[PDB]
């Protein structure tokens, strides 16, 4: 369905999973809480 964690993705494009988010300062996918 989506990529794994710590995956470089574009923010605002919603490419990573819904439970995770694309970080802007780190520039990679990660958990929210």
Curated annotation (Swiss-Prot):
Name of the protein in question: Mu/omega-theraphotoxin-Hs1a
Function statement: Lethal toxin with multiple biological activities. Inhibits voltage-gated TTX-sensitive sodium channels in DRG neurons (IC(50)=55 nM) and also shows activity when directly tested on Nav1.7/SCN9A (IC(50)=25.1-630 nM). Inhibits N-type calcium channels (Cav2.2/CACNA1B (IC(50)=100 nM)). Also blocks neuromuscular transmission. In vivo, intrathecal injected toxin shows analgesic activity in the rat formalin-induced pain model, without induction of motor dysfunction in rats.
Disulfide bond positions: 2-17, 9-22, 16-29
Family label: Belongs to the neurotoxin 10 (Hwtx-1) family. 23 (HwTx-I) subfamily.
Miscellaneous information on this protein: Negative results: shows very weak effect on calcium channel Cav1 subtypes. Does not show effect on calcium channel Cav3 subtypes. Does not show effect on voltage-gated potassium channels Kv (delayed rectifier). Does not show effect on voltage-gated TTX-resistant sodium channels. Is the most abundant toxin in the crude venom.
Listed result of changing residue 1 to Y: No decrease in bioactivity
Record remark on domains: The presence of a 'disulfide through disulfide knot' structurally defines this protein as a knottin.
């Amino acid at each position: 369905a989506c990529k794994g964690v710590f995956d470089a993705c574009t923010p605002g494009k919603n490419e990573c999973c819904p439970n995770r988010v694309c970080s802007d300062k780190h520039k990679w996918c990660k958990w929210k809480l």
